[PDB]
Amino acid sequence: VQLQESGPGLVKPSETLSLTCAVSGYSISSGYYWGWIRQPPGKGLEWIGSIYHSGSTYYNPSLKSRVTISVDTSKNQFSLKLSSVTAADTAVYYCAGLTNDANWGQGTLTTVSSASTKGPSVFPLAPSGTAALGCLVKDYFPEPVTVSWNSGALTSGVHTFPAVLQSSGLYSLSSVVTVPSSSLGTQTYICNVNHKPSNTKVDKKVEPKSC
Amino acid sequence: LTQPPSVSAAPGQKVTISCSGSSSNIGNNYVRWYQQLPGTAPKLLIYDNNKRPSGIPDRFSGSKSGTSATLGITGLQTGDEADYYCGTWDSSLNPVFGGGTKLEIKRTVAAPSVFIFPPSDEQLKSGTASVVCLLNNFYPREAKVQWKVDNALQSGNSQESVTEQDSKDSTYSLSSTLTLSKADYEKHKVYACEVTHQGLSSPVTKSFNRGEC
């Protein structure tokens, strides 16, 4: 059983947030319930609402007037609509359901902001018996970006930092890896950057500099 | 539902994490516990106050007493670094959650390895300069970075961020980025990052001169 959220990462103030949860490997009719729980950045969990076997729904009283949860049997998915959003609704949204152990989706960040989507520029952090190298993923909005190295083949020694919000209102993120200095001449290092809100994907080779 | 914001202990040791509720939530209802590794969804550890799902080792246990509940974790491992949440139901039988407790693993002091990176020519051509200082694999978390440009202390034009505790060696890493315009970057020669950490007997400086690369 796999759950997967999808939906816009950016919503404008006063507009409606819409998310869908695709349920694979299990039928929506056979679940005890399906529901949504959110987590504002750096904070705890807040239940939004659930829809049960019969179709009966229960919502968080502080959100009820703004929440709709529905099931689409034909597409085997369920949905969340949260109307009239504000910055207070910025959060990672999780779909969840019970088929004791509830299944969770991977979560999707939704930012509520008047700012617009902007794709990143990717710059190398070139290395010149351990060497450090990396990629600077600069000036994007909203979060998140994902970074891998050598298409996932390189994971040892990788550190991908939390994004920082610049005074410009755009994010920047660094991802680094430490490798043997003797490898720099023969091993290729590529950072794979994905910013889904702007549909920006970049594979950047980080080459040792001439110093 | 309140829990403490953090707890810490060395590998091999035990911790407990308490969840304080009321007569109408924990007092009347079952308690569940969740582990949330960084970047992942919560995972069920304990249900019905004290039962473990298949797949959860008996290093984890739960109990309930009155309006409070407790999660115990014995034989702490570096993999246990995570946010831990209690969950129960309120007077309307809707789910409610605690605020989460972050578990830190104590390890031996480790000095950072420091690296400095000039701006790429690629970025300079776009009109901006980011100078990056990396502090790699240190413990504990507290660390100070001071930027100097031609011996001028830089104050207010840098930002830093720190990784979550490493799942394998329990260290932190930190990156600091100094922002300058291209015109300002080309006005100066010596760019230096000075690092202070309890693992270092005296501060460590990494520097470069503009134009070496």
Domain B1-107, what architecture? Sandwich (2.60)
Method of structure determination? X-ray
Sign of CA dihedral A159, A160, A165, A167: positive
Fill in the DSSP letter of residue A114: S
Question: Are A76 and A70 contacting, i.e. CB atoms less than 8 angstroms apart?
Answer: no
CA–CA separation, B138 and B143 (whole Å)? 9
> Which residue type is seen at B54?
S
Q: Give CA–CA dist A166/A162, Å, rounded.
A: 12
Q: Domain map of chain A by residue range?
A: 1-114, 115-207
Closest by Cα among B124, B162, B120, B164 to B145: B162
Angstrom distance (rounded) from CA B145 to CA B158: 10
Domains A1-114 and A115-207 share a fold: yes
CA dihedral (B145, B147, B151, B157) in degrees, to 10, reads: -140
- Every domain of chain B and the residues it spans: 1-107, 108-213
Bridge partner residues of B145 (DSSP): B195
**Which residues from B are below 8 Å from A101, CB to CB?**
44, 47, 53
Instruction: State whether residue A134 sits within 8 Å of chain B by CB.
Output: yes
Query: B51 and chain A: CB distance < 8 Å anywhere?
Result: yes
Surface-to-core class of residue A62, CB atoms within 10 Å of its CB (0-12 exposed, 13-18 middle, 19+ buried) = exposed
Cis peptide before B5 (omega within 30 of 0): no
Q: What is the CA radius of gyration of chain A?
A: 21
On whether the CB atoms of residues B98 and B85 are closer than 8 A, the answer is: yes
What is the DSSP secondary structure assignment for residue A153, as one 8-state letter?
Answer: T
The correct answer on CATH 3.30.565.10 for the domain covering A1-114 is no
The single residue listed with the structure tokens 């309120």 is B90
DSSP string, chain B: -B--SEEEE-TT--EEEEEE--TTTTTTS--EEEEE-TTS--EEEEBTTTBPPTT--TTEEEEEETTEEEEEE-S--GGG-EEEEEEEE-TTS-EEE---EEEEE----BPPEEEEEPPPHHHHHHTEEEEEEEEEEEBSS--EEEEEETTEEP-SSEEEEEPPPPTTT--EEEEEEEEEEHHHHTT--EEEEEEE-TTSSS-EEEEEETT--
**Residues A185, A20: Cα–Cα separation, whole Å:** 47
Residue B5 contacts A where some CB pair is shorter than 8 Å: no
DSSP for B184-201 reads HHTT--EEEEEEE-TTSS
User: How far is residue A35's CA from residue B111's CA, in Å, rounded to a whole number?
Assistant: 46
Question: Within a 10 A sphere around the Cβ of A170, how many other Cβ atoms?
Answer: 17
CA distances from A133 to A122, A179, B81 (A): 14, 8, 26
Would the CATH topology of B1-107 be identical to that of B108-213? yes
Among A61, A57, A32, CA closest to A46: A61
User: Hey, what CATH topology would domain B108-213 get?
Assistant: Immunoglobulin-like (2.60.40)
Copy the structure tokens of residue B115: 């690296």
Virtual torsion, Cα A131, A135, A138, A142, nearest 10 deg = -120
Resolution (A): 1.5
Out of A100, A121, A136, closest to residue B47 by CB:
A100
Give me the count of residues in chain A: 211
Q: Which residue has the tokens 């390895």?
A: B113
Question: Cα torsion at A93, A98, A99, A103 (round to 10°)?
Answer: 40
Instruction: Check CB contact under 8 Å for A44 and B98.
Output: yes
Question: Which homologous superfamily does the CATH classification assign to the domain defined by A115-207?
Answer: Immunoglobulins (2.60.40.10)
What is the C-alpha radius of gyration for chain B, rounded to an integer number of angstroms?
A: 23
Which has the closest alpha carbon to A47: A57, A56, B126?
A57
Tokens of B141: 């978390």
Please tell me the distance from the alpha carbon of residue A38 to that of residue A43, in angstroms, as a whole number: 10
Given its phi and psi angles, is residue A120 left (phi above 0), alpha (psi -120 to 50 degrees) or beta?
beta
B159 touches chain A (CB under 8 A): yes
Which CA distances in Å does B206 have to A136, B54, B113, B158? 19, 50, 10, 16
Instruction: Please answer yes or no on whether B96 and A60 come within 8 Å at the CB atom.
Output: no
Distance from CA of A177 to the nearest CA of B (A): 10
